[PDB]
Coordinates of C-alpha atoms in Angstrom, one line a residue:
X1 CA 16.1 -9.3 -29.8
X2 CA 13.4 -6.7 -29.2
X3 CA 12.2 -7.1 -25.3
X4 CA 9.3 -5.1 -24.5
X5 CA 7.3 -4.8 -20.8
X6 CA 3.8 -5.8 -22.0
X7 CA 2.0 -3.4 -18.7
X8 CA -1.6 -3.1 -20.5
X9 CA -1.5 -7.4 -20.9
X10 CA -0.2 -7.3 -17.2
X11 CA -3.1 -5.3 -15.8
X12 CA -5.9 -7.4 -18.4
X13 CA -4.6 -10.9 -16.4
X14 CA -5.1 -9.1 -12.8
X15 CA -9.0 -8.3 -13.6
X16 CA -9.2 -12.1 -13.5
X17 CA -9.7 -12.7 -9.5
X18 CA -7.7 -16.0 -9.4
X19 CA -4.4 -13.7 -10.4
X20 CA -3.2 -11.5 -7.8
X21 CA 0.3 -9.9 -9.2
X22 CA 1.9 -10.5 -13.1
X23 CA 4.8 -9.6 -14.7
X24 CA 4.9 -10.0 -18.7
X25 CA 7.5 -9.5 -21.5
X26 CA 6.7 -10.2 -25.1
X27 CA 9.7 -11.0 -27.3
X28 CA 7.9 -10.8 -30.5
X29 CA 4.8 -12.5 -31.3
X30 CA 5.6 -15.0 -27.7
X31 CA 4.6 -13.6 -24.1
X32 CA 6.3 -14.7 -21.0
X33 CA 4.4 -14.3 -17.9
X34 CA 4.9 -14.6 -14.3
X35 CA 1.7 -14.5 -12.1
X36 CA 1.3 -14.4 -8.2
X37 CA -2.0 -16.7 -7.7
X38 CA -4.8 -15.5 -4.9
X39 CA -4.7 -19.1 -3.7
X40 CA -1.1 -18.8 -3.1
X41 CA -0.4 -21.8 -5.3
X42 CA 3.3 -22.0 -6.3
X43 CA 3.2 -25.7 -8.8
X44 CA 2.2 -26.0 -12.4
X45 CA -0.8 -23.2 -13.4
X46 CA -3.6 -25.6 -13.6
X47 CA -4.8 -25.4 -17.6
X48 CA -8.2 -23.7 -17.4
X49 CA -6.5 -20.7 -15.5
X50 CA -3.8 -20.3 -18.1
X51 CA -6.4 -20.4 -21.3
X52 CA -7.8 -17.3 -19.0
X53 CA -4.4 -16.0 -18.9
X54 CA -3.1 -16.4 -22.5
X55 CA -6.9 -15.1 -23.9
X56 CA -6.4 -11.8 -21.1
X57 CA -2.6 -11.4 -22.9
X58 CA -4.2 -11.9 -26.6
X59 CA -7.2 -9.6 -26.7
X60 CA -4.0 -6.8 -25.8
X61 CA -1.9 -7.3 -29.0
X62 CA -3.4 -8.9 -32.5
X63 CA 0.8 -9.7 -32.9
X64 CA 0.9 -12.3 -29.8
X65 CA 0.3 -15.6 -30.8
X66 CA 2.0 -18.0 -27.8
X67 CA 1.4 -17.3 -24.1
X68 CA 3.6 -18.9 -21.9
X69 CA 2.8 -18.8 -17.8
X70 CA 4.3 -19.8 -14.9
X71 CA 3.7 -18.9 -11.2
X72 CA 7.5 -20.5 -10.4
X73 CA 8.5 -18.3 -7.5
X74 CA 12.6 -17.7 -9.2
X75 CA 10.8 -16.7 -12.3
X76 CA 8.3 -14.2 -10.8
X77 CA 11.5 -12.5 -9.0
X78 CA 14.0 -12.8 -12.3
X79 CA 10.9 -11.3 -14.8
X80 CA 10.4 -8.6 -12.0
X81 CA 14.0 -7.7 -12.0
X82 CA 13.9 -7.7 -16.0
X83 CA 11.0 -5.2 -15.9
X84 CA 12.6 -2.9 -14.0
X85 CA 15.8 -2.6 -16.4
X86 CA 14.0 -2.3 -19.6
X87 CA 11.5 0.5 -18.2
X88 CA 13.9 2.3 -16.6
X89 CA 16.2 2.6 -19.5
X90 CA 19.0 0.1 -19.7
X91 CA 20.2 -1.9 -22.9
X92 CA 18.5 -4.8 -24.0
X93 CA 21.6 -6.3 -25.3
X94 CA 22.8 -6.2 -21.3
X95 CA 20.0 -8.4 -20.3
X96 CA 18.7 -10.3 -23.3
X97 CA 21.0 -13.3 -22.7
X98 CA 20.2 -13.8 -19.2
X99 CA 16.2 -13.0 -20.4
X100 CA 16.8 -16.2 -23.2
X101 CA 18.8 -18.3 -20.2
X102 CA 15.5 -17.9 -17.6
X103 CA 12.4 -18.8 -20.5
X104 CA 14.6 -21.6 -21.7
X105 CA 14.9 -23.1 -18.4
X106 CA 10.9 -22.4 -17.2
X107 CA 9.4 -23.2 -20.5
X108 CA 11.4 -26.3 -22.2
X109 CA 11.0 -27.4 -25.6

């Protein structure tokens, strides 16, 4: 139930040069992030790219265990949205059901 914008693990993946812009939420020991690639590449973050990613999001927080990425254009707008309403203030029981609806859908069992 406890969302939390993960900025420090969000700035660590953009010193990689392949990741331009990401967006990251930890619920827990589990990070969701949304990443805007250099290349402009939209699909699937090839696997090499997201071991950089997840080790970038792990060397932040001994807690975080799973690192899930996706550069899905829907997700990087919804987790941006997200970001904005926990930072600036608002409940996370307004938004923690939508939150649970959008990483079910982008990362299935």
């Amino acid at each position: 139930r406890k969302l939390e914008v993960a900025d420090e693990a969000a700035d660590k993946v953009t010193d990689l040069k392949e990741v331009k812009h990401a967006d990251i939420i930890v619920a827990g020991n589990q990070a969701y992030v949304a990443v805007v690639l250099t290349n402009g590449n939209k699909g699937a973050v090839e696997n090499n790219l997201k071991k950089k990613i997840a080790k970038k999001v792990r060397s932040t927080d001994k807690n975080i265990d799973n690192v899930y990425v996706s550069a899905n254009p829907d997700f990087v707008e919804r987790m941006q949205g997200y970001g904005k309403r926990i930072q600036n203030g608002d409940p996370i029981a307004g938004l923690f059901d939508e939150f649970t609806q959008t990483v079910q859908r982008v990362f299935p069992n």
